[PDB]
Design an enzyme around this catalytic site. Structure first.
Site, PDB file in Angstrom:
ATOM      1  N   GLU A   1      -1.566   0.472  -1.639  1.00  0.00           N
ATOM      2  CA  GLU A   1      -2.309   1.689  -1.317  1.00  0.00           C
ATOM      3  C   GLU A   1      -1.253   2.882  -1.540  1.00  0.00           C
ATOM      4  O   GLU A   1      -0.280   2.753  -0.780  1.00  0.00           O
ATOM      5  CB  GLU A   1      -2.665   1.551   0.285  1.00  0.00           C
ATOM      6  CG  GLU A   1      -3.767   0.434   0.407  1.00  0.00           C
ATOM      7  CD  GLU A   1      -4.076  -0.011   1.795  1.00  0.00           C
ATOM      8  OE1 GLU A   1      -3.436   0.428   2.866  1.00  0.00           O
ATOM      9  OE2 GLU A   1      -5.102  -0.883   1.640  1.00  0.00           O
TER      10      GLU A   1
ATOM     11  N   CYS B   1      -4.656   8.662   4.956  1.00  0.00           N
ATOM     12  CA  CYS B   1      -4.785   8.426   3.718  1.00  0.00           C
ATOM     13  C   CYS B   1      -5.965   9.016   3.005  1.00  0.00           C
ATOM     14  O   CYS B   1      -6.112   9.257   1.754  1.00  0.00           O
ATOM     15  CB  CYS B   1      -4.431   6.985   3.327  1.00  0.00           C
ATOM     16  SG  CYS B   1      -2.911   6.462   3.854  1.00  0.00           S
TER      17      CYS B   1
END
Lengths: 526, 519
Positions: B258, B297
């Site tokens: 990620e 994020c």
């Protein structure tokens, strides 16, 4: 003048490589067949024409329209099999029955995916699972979907299966709307290139959907970008150089690896010399040593048997291997042909010499003269059967793959407080494999033992008398079943029927009002 | 001299690192909180004890037994929420509501997996799909299975979610029978260490199932082996350094990444200012820039709107952003706290200066006095909103992520002929792959069709319309039943998606056998 130089098909055009090229040769007769070269190709264009034109053209068709093109390719390949069998006999030195594993294996796998694909309907995206409510009143829900990746699929394929390695990967890739660039191993590239030339000539697929490069691999990975996929089959050595390239480390392109695999066969405690299951074991071991001279990735390399059964095993294998005649596949008296090349023959003889330092040679028919072939020209190797009496302490049994008609037998200590526990542990020492087979008279026992091997083997293949007539073979890859394995075997997954489509798609969670999820769902299928 | 040195939990023991340690500080007040150190730990032994003692112990249990332990963790963490909120206020500088995204998001996810795992029953392996005949007479068949990998799960977790990053990953790992080793980012590690310490102290899980190391990462990857799995959450540049390690390139350990993600929100052509979709879009952008000071994020970094809507959009965003008060989260008047640290403060400020070289700054409340905080000490950044008039020719818009309360608005050209948002779709894709894009319309059917156009470049597409104003779960909020991850720049990873998460922790195998042996 010189043998035929096979052209590459790139950016919608047949283009020759420059230079003298690399000659392919008959591994039986030493005759020069054809040449390949990729020198001077514009690799930037090759990849961009595939990725843009190839991918847009494929994505404009539905799954069912793509599946109908696969069915059309099936009919074409079938009509030209006679040309294919002639190339296989000359380039690979395989018997007709062994050539069929590659030719007809490839064609069967393609047909399977053409039938599966017809069921996916006239849509451009697939449903993953069903819809799930994200709210008490069900006004807001979630539905996952699969969409073709906006990239190309690069196949770097092993020398053993020029046909099957093409079609096993290309069928799900093309059905998923993803354009293919195939790079077959040089030594046996001819069949791959002729099959591609045949399909391209027929105009079944859009321009840019199917490209081929034969010769040096230099520069291919440098063209790979983040939405592309790569499927590599080859040596564990090579696989580690490949993994380190920026395409994967910086750009994150998906990668499948198939590599070295020291597949096991385990004779259960109940399968003593007097029972039906003993002979099923003997037969399967000799089959996998000798089909294609033991050049399947899935072939049994290690065979584990109870201490008490070791002598009767070695005697029964000796007697069956004795029936295996070796030579020129053009002669119908020949049971087993050559390896793919003289170069591989050297690798295999070197492999045998290194195993000999730690094992005893129980069978080797190398002194027998070859049928219709010269042992100083041909790449023929005789079956060799090694014995390793102390597999717990063995230095090489569990680590060194010999990609030839070679296997080692080892005793295990029966656990008689699973009886096969020590064999399970020994199979694990291969550090991760494509397949293990297990042999027993007891069908219920097979189920339990299979789960014990499942976390270190991509397939577990259980053979017993009730399926003597129906079991599909240790080394034979059925396309509806997973192919790949953890650890040393590479950590990869292919085939598995519908499972194969995911490697070529991007998965997404769509979260929306229920009427939007209803409209999405009308444009999809599973 | 000296705040508490938090111990590591390794090889079933609490062990302090040697030396002075690295101090964690409150990003508002500058107070020294706790210290961490991994110096001199025996990593070979930490990894071996989890792999061997931990793995054997977890695989001994069934999926339903493991899920029962997860339910007991849920009850424990719920009883300790008062302690967790106090740590979050001090170490992270977040308002009570934004702390809850980490603390109560973690617990909610862990509880979701506890309930899901109870349904899996008293078994030690799972079936993948149904049995399939491999023979005319059906005497021989195949069944695929999933079996726990005989490895450890190493989580290298980002600073923004010390609780949710632990539990989103650990919940499917532990349900799958795989021991966990967590390495939280140093600056905000306290809450992760405290949660692990409470769980360990309670004796819910077998020794070896749960380990934590806080401090330097040196030497951790050197211990990873071929049956282990690693889930990394962090910057693209650190991801690329990690991918090159022998653990992956030679040993083939599974990896999930990620990384940076320039998430989009697209206002549809039909959502004009006199329609209800319009305000839904304004509100969502404001919320994503401001929750945790923009440190999710999944926050919206690019907002694409029709040319005709550009001025009303700028004016309506200015109006909403001006209501966002900034300062000490201890003050109930504050709507938005600090970034995680003074170092991130400097990084965000350098990012702002970098974007401004190519975009006009349309809104900035930097000069507004902070509430109960000193600008020379605290890590508070005010909302900044940028406008990029020519997004086709912009560089930085689509490439540079500012991890703060910062976003850019850009107009797109509505297509009038036989989707109206065709250009906005193209602009979203220029972010080179993202965790999430959100889309906003009055027309629900229209949102279905548009969603499919963004699906190949976004791990999640999140549609907001009037019919779901009360029920939509939010652009940046991660529902554990839905896929989390994205292609390309965002890392190529997949996590969550309910049962889908289990597969990362298992090995799949085709078993081919007599029909009696099968299923």
């Amino acid at each position: 003048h010189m043998t035929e130089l096979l052209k590459n098909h790139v950016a919608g055009q047949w283009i020759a490589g420059t230079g003298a090229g690399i000659t392919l040769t008959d591994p039986v007769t030493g005759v020069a067949l054809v040449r390949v070269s990729s020198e001077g190709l514009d690799l930037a264009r090759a990849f961009s024409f595939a990725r843009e034109d190839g991918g847009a053209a494929l994505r404009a068709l539905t799954y069912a329209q793509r599946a109908a093109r696969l069915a059309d390719i099936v009919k074409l390949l079938q009509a030209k099999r006679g040309d294919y069998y002639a190339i296989a006999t000359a380039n690979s030195g395989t018997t007709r029955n062994d050539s069929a594993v590659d030719i007809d294996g490839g064609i069967f796998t393609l047909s399977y995916y053409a039938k599966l694909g017809a069921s996916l309907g006239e849509v451009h995206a697939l449903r993953d699972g069903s819809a799930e409510s994200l709210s008490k009143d069900r006004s807001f829900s979630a539905q996952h979907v699969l969409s073709p990746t906006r990239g190309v699929a690069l196949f770097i394929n092993a020398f053993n299966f020029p046909s099957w390695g093409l079609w096993e990967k290309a069928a799900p890739a093309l059905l998923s709307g993803v354009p293919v660039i195939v790079k077959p191993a040089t030594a046996t590239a001819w069949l791959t290139q002729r099959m591609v030339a045949d399909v391209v000539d027929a105009g079944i697929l859009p321009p840019g959907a199917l490209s081929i490069i034969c010769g040096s691999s230099a520069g291919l990975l440098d063209q790979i970008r983040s939405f592309d996929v790569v499927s590599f089959t080859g040596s564990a050595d090579t696989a580690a150089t490949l993994r380190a390239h920026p395409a994967f480390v910086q750009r994150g392109a998906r990668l499948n690896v198939e590599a070295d695999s020291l597949n096991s066969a385990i004779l259960c405690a109940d399968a003593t010399p007097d029972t039906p299951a003993f002979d099923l074991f003997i037969k399967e071991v000799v089959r996998e040593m000798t089909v294609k001279s033991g050049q399947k990735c899935t072939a049994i390399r290690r065979a584990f048997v109870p201490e008490a059964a070791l002598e009767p095993v070695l005697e029964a294998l000796k007697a069956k291997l004795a029936k295996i005649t070796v030579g020129n596949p053009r002669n119908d008296a020949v049971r087993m042909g050559s390896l793919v090349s003289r170069e591989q023959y050297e690798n295999v003889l070197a492999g045998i010499a290194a195993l000999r330092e730690e094992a005893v040679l129980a069978y080797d028919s190398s002194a027998v003269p070859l049928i219709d072939a010269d042992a100083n020209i041909a790449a023929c190797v005789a079956p060799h059967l090694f014995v390793v009496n102390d597999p717990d302490n063995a230095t090489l049994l569990h680590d060194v793959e010999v990609f030839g008609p070679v296997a080692s037998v080892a005793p295990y200590r029966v656990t008689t407080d699973l009886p096969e526990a020590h064999a399970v542990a020994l199979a694990r020492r291969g550090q991760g494999s494509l397949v293990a087979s297990i042999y027993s008279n007891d069908d219920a026992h097979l189920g339990r033992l299979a789960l014990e091997l499942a976390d270190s083997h991509g397939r577990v293949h259980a053979i017993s008398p009730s399926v003597q007539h129906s079991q599909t073979g240790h080394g034979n890859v059925m396309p509806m079943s997973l192919h790949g394995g953890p650890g040393r075997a590479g950590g990869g997954e292919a085939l598995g029927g519908l499972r194969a489509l995911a490697f070529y798609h991007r998965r997404s969670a769509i979260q929306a009002a229920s009427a939007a999820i209803g409209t999405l769902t009308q444009a999809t299928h599973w």
